[PDB]
Amino acid sequence: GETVKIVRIEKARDIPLGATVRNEMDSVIISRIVKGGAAEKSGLLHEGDEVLEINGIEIRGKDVNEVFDLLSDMHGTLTFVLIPS
Ligand SMILES: [Cl-]
């Protein structure tokens, strides 16, 4: 029951993404969606989503702090490639 989805989210310049992530082996999984952030506002990211790509950058195989680092420099439109829980 897995289907790859492409979702595009707008992240205003004074609004954090507000999503937390965890590693399950090489997989990167969304843990919490925080109220007030761009993720929550968009309604397009879900707890349990496995993140494959963000703006073309491969995400599988990366650790939690690497991912947060990458996100911190991404503004404007963010295109996620993911597998829903
Ligand atoms: Cl803006």
Numbering used by the authors: 251 to 335
Sentences from the paper on this structure:
In order to investigate the conformational changes that occur in Pals1PDZ upon binding Crb17 peptide, a ligand-free form of Pals1PDZ was crystallized and its structure was determined at 1.8 Å resolution. This crystal form has a single copy of Pals1PDZ in the asymmetric unit. The structure of ligand-free Pals1PDZ reveals a sterically blocked peptide-binding groove, as confirmed by fluorescence polarization in vitro. Firstly, the carboxylate-binding β1–β2 loop (residues 260–268) adopts a more open configuration pivoting at Glu260 and Leu267, resulting in a Cα shift of over 6.2 Å away from the C-terminal end of helix α2. We note that the ligand-free Pals1 PDZ domain closely resembles that of Par6, which is known to bind both internal and C-terminal peptide ligands. Examination of the open carboxylate-binding loop of ligand-free Pals1 PDZ domain with Par6 bound to an internal peptide ligand suggests that Pals1 could also bind internal ligands.
Apical localization of the Crumbs (Crb) transmembrane protein requires a PDZ-mediated interaction with Pals1 (protein-associated with Lin7, Stardust, MPP5), a member of the p55 family of membrane-associated guanylate kinases (MAGUKs).
